[PDB]
Design a binder for this molecule. Structure first.
Ligand SMILES: Nc1ncnc2c1ncn2[C@@H]1O[C@H](COP(=O)(O)OP(=O)(O)O)[C@@H](O)[C@H]1O
Ligand SMILES: Nc1ncnc2c1ncn2[C@@H]1O[C@H](COP(=O)(O)OP(=O)(O)O)[C@@H](O)[C@H]1O
Ligand SMILES: [Mg+2]
Ligand SMILES: [Mg+2]
Ligand SMILES: [Mg+2]
Ligand SMILES: [Mg+2]
Lengths: 414, 414
């Protein structure tokens, strides 16, 4: 228009408030990594489902006290015992094996001495119990860990390996979860060639599509590659329509400044009939970043039209796109994790809040990590795992110094 | 034997020193996420490959100074200009467009006023240049960002989205990288049922296989599911042989304590002829953790025989297995990231170093995160992202208090 300059705070809130939560689907539990449960999950069995030994040793009668005992048999893992332990008797048990009838405590083998074994030494016959067992000692009673009817996982849980293990434990192998967003990515510009191409006069290779797709894929979301689209409204409209058909989210880059051939905002508004919620953001980099929604038949499509500059594209993708995707896949608090870190070098502040990729590193016993802006030798073997978030300058603060504590958004595994 | 108690420090060093680095393969650059480069990568072109405008504005002759100028045409993105800018003339340019011959500076549109346009207002004809351009201002010379022949990525680089983008930029679409390890996982025990099974007397469901496979998959490595193997040496040998054939790494759980039917160490040694480097570790949990190598025809297979207890299995998988896998896939320093955090509650120290899953959380402006051991309500919607690493007790230190700073290994995205 030019569009109003939107504050970072308002732009971010706007993205999260306007982004929908996707519907649900049933998945196999093995496919649950990174998913959010859309149901409560209940145990249908006790864990353990039988009284289980905590130790390798002997199932005893505590009332017998210490002394010499005949071993009447063994309770082996996976087998329900058939014998009853009577006074003066014990049964061998291993960890996790059921406690036989008649026994009420377990004595670990270290608190015993073997008296007699078979001639071939493969079977124990008599044992000395050296201790007075406490009632129920070293036994896990039925349901000690999980009770039948217990809710073991609540709706809203963002699942990792241990949650998958818990689903396996309780035998709930199919679960309702939020869908993952399908994200389509296109690049724009008459100057762009594919990465596979040799250069031609006036041209460069398209890097944003690769960087953006890789960023989305890193977070586990399925993607669609919409290729390179030229700087003309008909082609852009057609590509956007393909993205809308095939995906939940459409990400473009380029064509959003006020240049003569920057057409995307016009197309989104007049041709696509989308609602542009902001078209400029007071931030460095990322001034022309644009966010739109399009509602079709009760479905809300999300569109991010990111700046063409490759550094701007990847920065704004991490600030705006990834949190939106997290909300779409059902994460209750989709905000990224922000940590405190020490600046590795002096930095000049801008009237705009500034963002820059960095690497976070912990130094021996020092409590806070150091943030080193990208762009020594070994400090190039690691990919960026942070985004420095620097405040706007003020009459007082014009520069931040090495050692000062700043906010860093986590964008890679630390 | 029982095997000697190995210190945590020695066990860890032993795993890393004895674990091999896998060989290399050529991959498509799009598949590069998490891979380590095994070659240096060089640019074969300049970036930019032509002198490129930094701004939307006009290509001018600085020697003309400010004044009124005829616009002879436009340099559009993706097109090599054909006209030469003469004294008194300018050419329209957009960001990233080539600078035409004859021009030596760019003046951004904000430093101009339009004098004359075509009757239909689609073409600019005359413009007032309001400033004295500095020589070469707002032009990116050829090779400003990347020079032909420049090494843009070094061997040893662990790649993320920005590295993939750089490969795309320089048109290096196939790259030599280290292979990823293929990891086979089996569970052991006569008491185990599949997750899909209803319970039978004396039985429980196998959770470790799911938890371990999910842990490995989370780090991006391919896996093989070897199922449930009974407590007998013939079956265990056959399953191990299948794992050796199909995978680089074999992970078992269960059968490694001194119980009667704990057979794995015997099988590894006498039947498989593997070299067991440790069979007990002075740690809590994880006492019976076992690490072996097997060298066949100049190939080293790695075997981790983890404890059967499900908490022990997942803890030791994170402490020993994941760092080994990182070394195998070529990461130069495969050690996990260890951060400092404040204990959320008092904790009792053990003679053994203790490890427990936790959740790391940052509180408003407080510099250090808090570590809350797993096992409020909302503090159950998030999966564990840390492993608390508590020191052995001493005559002095028997307990750690809420607020005290401890080491936490990162195991999930923060
Ligand atoms: N895959 C598994 N899933 C769940 N529990 C298991 C699994 N494997 C073993 N366990 C349980 O862990 C405990 C220890 O099993 P065991 O095979 O004796 O381990 P170890 O001998 O290595 O200590 C037993 O209670 C057993 O039932
Ligand atoms: N996919 C891409 N890969 C690499 N560079 C790009 C890409 N898209 C745009 N650029 C470059 O970024 C700069 C800005 O492009 P432009 O389309 O004008 O973005 P905007 O109008 O959003 O600022 C130009 O130098 C352009 O060549
Ligand atoms: Mg463009
Ligand atoms: Mg532009
Ligand atoms: Mg067992
Ligand atoms: Mg055992």
């Amino acid at each position: 228009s030019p569009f109003p300059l939107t504050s970072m705070d308002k732009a971010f809130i706007t993205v999260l408030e306007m982004t929908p939560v996707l519907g649900t689907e049933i998945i196999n539990y093995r496919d649950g990594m990174g998913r959010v449960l859309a149901q409560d999950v209940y145990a249908k069995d006790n864990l353990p489902p039988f009284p289980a030994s905590v130790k390798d040793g002997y199932a005893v009668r505590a009332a017998d006290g210490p002394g010499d005992r005949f071993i009447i048999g063994e309770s082996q893992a996976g087998e329900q015992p058939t014998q009853t332990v009577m006074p003066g008797q014990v049964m061998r048990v291993t960890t996790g094996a059921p406690i036989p009838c008649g026994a009420d405590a377990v004595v670990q083998v270290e608190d015993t001495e073997l008296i007699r074994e078979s001639d071939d030494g493969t079977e124990e016959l008599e044992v000395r119990i050296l201790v007075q067992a406490r009632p129920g000692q070293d036994i896990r009673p039925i349901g000690h860990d999980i009770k039948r009817g217990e809710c073991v996982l609540a709706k809203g849980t963002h699942m990792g390996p241990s949650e998958i293990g818990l689903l396996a434990t309780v035998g709930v192998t199919e679960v309702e979860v939020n869908k993952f967003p399908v994200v389509a990515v296109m690049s724009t510009g008459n100057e762009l060639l594919n990465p596979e191409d040799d250069l031609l006069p006036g041209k460069i290779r398209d890097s944003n599509r690769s960087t953006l797709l890789a960023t989305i894929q890193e977070h586990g979301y399925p993607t669609i590659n919409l290729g390179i689209v030229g700087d003309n409204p008909d082609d852009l409209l057609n590509a956007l329509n393909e993205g809308i058909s095939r995906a939940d989210v459409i990400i473009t880059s380029g064509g959003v400044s006020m240049g003569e051939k920057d057409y995307l905002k016009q197309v989104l508004d007049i041709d696509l009939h989308a609602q542009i919620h902001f078209g400029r953001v007071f931030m460095k980099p990322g001034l022309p970043t644009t966010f739109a929604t399009l509602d079709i038949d009760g479905v809300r499509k999300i569109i991010f039209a990111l700046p063409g500059n490759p550094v701007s594209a990847v920065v704004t993708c991490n600030l705006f796109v990834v949190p939106a995707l997290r909300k779409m896949q059902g994460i209750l608090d989709p905000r990224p994790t922000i940590i405190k870190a020490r600046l590795s070098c002096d930095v000049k502040l801008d009237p705009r809040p500034e963002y820059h990729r960095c690497i976070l590193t912990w130094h021996h016993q020092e409590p806070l990590p150091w943030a080193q802006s990208t762009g020594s030798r070994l400090m190039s073997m690691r990919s960026a795992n942070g985004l420095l978030m620097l405040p706007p300058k003020t009459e007082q603060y014009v520069e931040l110094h090495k050692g000062e504590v700043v906010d860093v958004m986590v964008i890679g595994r630390l």
